[PDB]
Amino acid sequence: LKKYTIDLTERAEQGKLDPVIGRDEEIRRTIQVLQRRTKNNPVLIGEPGVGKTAIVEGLAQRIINGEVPEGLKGRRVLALDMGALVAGAKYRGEFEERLKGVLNDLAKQEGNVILFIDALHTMAGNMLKPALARGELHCVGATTLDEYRQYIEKDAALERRFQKVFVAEPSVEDTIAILRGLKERYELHHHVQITDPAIVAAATLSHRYIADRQLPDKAIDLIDEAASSIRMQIDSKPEELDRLDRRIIQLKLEQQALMKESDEASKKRLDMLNEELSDKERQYSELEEEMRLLRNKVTDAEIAEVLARWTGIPVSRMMESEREKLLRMEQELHHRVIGQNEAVDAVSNAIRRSRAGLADPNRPIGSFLFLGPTGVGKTELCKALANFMFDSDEAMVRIDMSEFMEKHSVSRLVGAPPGYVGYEEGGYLTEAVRRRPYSVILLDAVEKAHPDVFNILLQVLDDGRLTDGQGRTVDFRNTVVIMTSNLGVRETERKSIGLIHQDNSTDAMEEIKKIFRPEFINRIDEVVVFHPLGEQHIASIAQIQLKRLYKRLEERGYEIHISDEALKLLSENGYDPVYGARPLKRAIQQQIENPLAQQILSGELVPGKVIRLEVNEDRIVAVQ
Amino acid sequence: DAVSNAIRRSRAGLADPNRPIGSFLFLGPTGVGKTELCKALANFMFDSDEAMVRIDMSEFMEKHSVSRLVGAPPGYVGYEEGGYLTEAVRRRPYSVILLDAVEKAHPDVFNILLQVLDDGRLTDGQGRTVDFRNTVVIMTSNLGVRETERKSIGLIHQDNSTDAMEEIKKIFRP
Amino acid sequence: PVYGARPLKRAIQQQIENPLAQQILSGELVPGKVIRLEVNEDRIVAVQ
Amino acid sequence: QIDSKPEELDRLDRRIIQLKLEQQALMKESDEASKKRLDMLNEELSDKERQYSELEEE
Amino acid sequence: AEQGKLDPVIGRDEEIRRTIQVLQRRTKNNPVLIGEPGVGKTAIVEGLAQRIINGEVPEGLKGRRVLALDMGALVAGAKYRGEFEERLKGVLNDLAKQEGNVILFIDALHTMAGNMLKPALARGELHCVGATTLDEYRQYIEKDAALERRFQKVFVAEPSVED
Ligand SMILES: Nc1ncnc2c1ncn2[C@@H]1O[C@H](COP(=O)(O)OP(=O)(O)OP(O)(O)=S)[C@@H](O)[C@H]1O
Ligand SMILES: Nc1ncnc2c1ncn2[C@@H]1O[C@H](COP(=O)(O)OP(=O)(O)OP(O)(O)=S)[C@@H](O)[C@H]1O
Ligand SMILES: Nc1ncnc2c1ncn2[C@@H]1O[C@H](COP(=O)(O)OP(=O)(O)OP(O)(O)=S)[C@@H](O)[C@H]1O
Ligand SMILES: Nc1ncnc2c1ncn2[C@@H]1O[C@H](COP(=O)(O)OP(=O)(O)OP(O)(O)=S)[C@@H](O)[C@H]1O
């Protein structure tokens, strides 16, 4: 008891055990087990982070703090932790000897020293049952759910040794009382003065967002991380000084990339960045020679910037300048997708209300069932939205739902039942959107998937979470979906002419209301129906079809200027009454790119010189 | 009044001990607020929507989904991880369970469900007994929406009951 | 008749709350005061 | 229950220990005009002290 | 690193501020670099060592020095029941002798026993550095809320042209 044990009451005497304000219920549950003769060893069972070790050591905090009544005063808490019994016994038999020594010690305590097994799955059993049979061992269990059950559940002799402990959960109120009850201990443990908004945002926002740990402790280590980044601010220089100096370090690593060259002077095209280097010396000198350089407002906005680096709705963007690209979000789509006014306003306004957040957080954000014709370019619009917000097309997780015809379809895409290859491989959308849950959940042709797939669209559209075969919640409460499904193609291509719009809504709503409930008609953002294009739109997609060719042949170092007559021939070959604007790239390549390749390989086009496409033909030809 | 009188019967004590406490079949058009009322049922007596999980019978249609509700056969992943029904009831047997669209489930969940109803004992992949004899279940349906919203004009309630009980009759027992 | 008062969630958030979000985040509406649902013209507009 | 303080007595004493150590949390705040709302927990604490004094006497 | 035998880095300041900013905690205290074996995360912990030792770092990481428990001498002679145990308790007590002025960059973080590592990481008595592959940080474990209270990660994405 003097060699192997750690005195938890002494830990609560000096105060290395962080004081626990509240929860008298389960410490009273411990004391109620301690008066109990049989089933005398309590087992603290919660999730990890219900504080099982901290409830035994806080039971020592009660035994020193006198909140315990008569009966246990004198019965001493001494904790056999792991690591203690692992002494230099290189040979056998001495283990049973030293255990016989310490069980003669608690055998002569006679209810004066209480034993404790920290992380109960450690310790034995061949010797504690006599010491739990006379009345001489008084041990305590504190370990997790899996480590108590797999410690032992099913021995009816050892569950005769161990009683479990179960809890009750009130509101976020007493979590706020944990955070204010601990915030000055982490002032003198975290070098600050904890104002309230960081911890009340930690409590309420922890009860809203975090689906991995539990109240209040997820808020507690959020304040740990918070005061960590705060002391990162405390011991460094003031703010904009570190803006200047840190961008000096990283950007001089960029010029460190941008100096070791073949010819240094000609590719010093970054000369503005070096005048800006001496300018960073200039304003960085203004602010080194020269609060709002301080934050006791920790802040909710700034650990909302940390959590905003986590989730997928930012607030670090919120203190930036964003309204100028918001007010021409239509026109910044018109740089690559022109026309379709109720589509760019219904879709773009649906993006505004979506990432603005006007619905339930326990509802999805941008929820779209697309229904309409072809000849439009849906995946290039999905690339316009990943290349719009995601700034390039990583989010385009394209998972075709066409494969799913037989009985076992939700074992296919949801994930297989365990005990097989398919569960560890998981489902299709379940896994490839399990990697990025807060992203574009892009789907083509969902209608051929199961009714069960339809009602788990009713799960990610009502609830906004997903469940595989095992039974956990993949969180979708912070993602925008795009469903470029192939529901519309035959109905909306076949509807012209002879079928009015209410009839396509009638039989398409006979498919939806054939399987879905009214919330699939209702709870999407918009039913976005497209229309065919005009001639100036053909001119615009010619221009932006050329801008990619400008940057592409720009990487080689050539120049091409095109007259208006070739524009007139492409406008002539642009539109057909049956198909629309799709074969334009094929006509451009078949009439333009054949003599261009023929003369760039033939030798008639000279490198290092400007190229111009003229017409010494009845079609487009190349010349120098 | 139906669910509230079911609560007064629940805390009152009328029930047969070889039965579940509450079991109902809801039919009709959709738009009434079923699982919002189940969120109020998670709000009233044990006081928390944290204790509302909402369970579905749709994804569980396969050859091994019987071993999803009972746990896998031995020698499998999900045998040591168990099943959703056996672990879920085995943690706290006195709780509120929210099922959806049981027609999606097989006649093997209807016979495990019969063991919820009759004689009160479920044997899993392993085979040990499962305590179901004081458990409250809630099961919603799509039989109401898929033949009521179009037949709301003209049809009567008895014929609604019969043309539910036909496809029920093909795949359930009385 | 089939649908009921179910779409009224998005009749509110869609039908009024899109220009309301435009006017709140536009900077016209300074926060901090008691809101009275005023009447501009025949489509519902909230004014601060 | 006979050796120590009675059941309704330590229900009450432990409700007032919930509210009192809840105030030991609830002292240091951020701004006054928002988070000194807790008037209602104070009059509930008056029910706590009065009922605990009543069954303290009885 | 004083002798300068290690590999340099180019750029790498924002997400290594994510590495230092995930270093200086108490429990969750240890960073994890995420990514496959063709990205270079050991250059990020050793460029971390070059910021700590060379001196662009502010106050706090001036004197900190990094050690490395490896599995090789752990499994070298495990002849009897206790050799590996006397040697690992020697590791933990030598962690106690430099008193937390030992940084322990454990690469292959799941390799390092553990119930003797958990409470010292919990009190503040232990503080290390972790590293595991993208798929293998999906394999490490995140739902053990205890081992959620022992470690934390650093985010790195798909590489670009300019870098
Ligand atoms: N009210 C509180 N007062 C003080 N510290 C608290 C409080 N709530 C949580 N903690 C912290 O909770 C942390 C975890 O407690 P533990 O003693 O590890 O209990 P535990 O859940 O059994 O951990 P194990 O045994 O490793 S599973 C400690 O580091 C405490 O700082
Ligand atoms: N606006 C556009 N800009 C650039 N390329 C386009 C455009 N529209 C179509 N394309 C090209 O033509 C192809 C067809 O466009 P998509 O965006 O895939 O149309 P789609 O309806 O999504 O076809 P799916 O996905 O096979 S049903 C694209 O992959 C591009 O190569
Ligand atoms: N009348 C209503 N009152 C309140 N909330 C409603 C109502 N109707 C729908 N909801 C919301 O929409 C969700 C689904 O609608 P429900 O009324 O529960 O019908 P349902 O049959 O449960 O559909 P589910 O939940 O997808 S199986 C609920 O969880 C609520 O969030
Ligand atoms: N950041 C870097 N800076 C400098 N050289 C690097 C860098 N990353 C990789 N290298 C080079 O690549 C070689 C090995 O790359 P590693 O850094 O070991 O890749 P890795 O991601 O660490 O994968 P491991 O270590 O095999 S798991 C080194 O010998 C260097 O030549």
Short mmCIF file of C-alpha atoms in Angstrom, two decimals, chain C residues 1 3 6 8 10 12-15 18-19 23 25-26 28-29 31 35-37 40 43-45 47:
data_model
loop_
_atom_site.label_atom_id
_atom_site.label_comp_id
_atom_site.label_asym_id
_atom_site.label_seq_id
_atom_site.Cartn_x
_atom_site.Cartn_y
_atom_site.Cartn_z
CA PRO C 1 -55.28 19.01 -50.77
CA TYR C 3 -49.90 18.25 -49.70
CA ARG C 6 -46.40 20.99 -45.44
CA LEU C 8 -45.33 26.39 -45.79
CA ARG C 10 -40.43 26.80 -47.74
CA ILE C 12 -41.84 31.15 -45.53
CA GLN C 13 -38.10 30.69 -46.03
CA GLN C 14 -38.26 30.63 -49.83
CA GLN C 15 -41.08 33.11 -50.44
CA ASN C 18 -34.62 35.30 -49.68
CA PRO C 19 -34.95 39.10 -50.20
CA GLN C 23 -31.56 43.08 -47.21
CA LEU C 25 -26.71 40.94 -45.24
CA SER C 26 -26.75 43.86 -47.70
CA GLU C 28 -29.43 48.23 -45.18
CA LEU C 29 -30.68 46.68 -41.91
CA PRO C 31 -29.17 44.98 -36.15
CA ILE C 35 -38.85 44.42 -35.52
CA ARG C 36 -42.33 45.50 -36.64
CA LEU C 37 -43.72 43.76 -39.72
CA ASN C 40 -44.69 48.09 -48.23
CA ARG C 43 -45.62 41.28 -51.70
CA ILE C 44 -44.60 40.89 -48.04
CA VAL C 45 -41.54 42.99 -47.11
CA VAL C 47 -38.49 46.85 -43.02
#
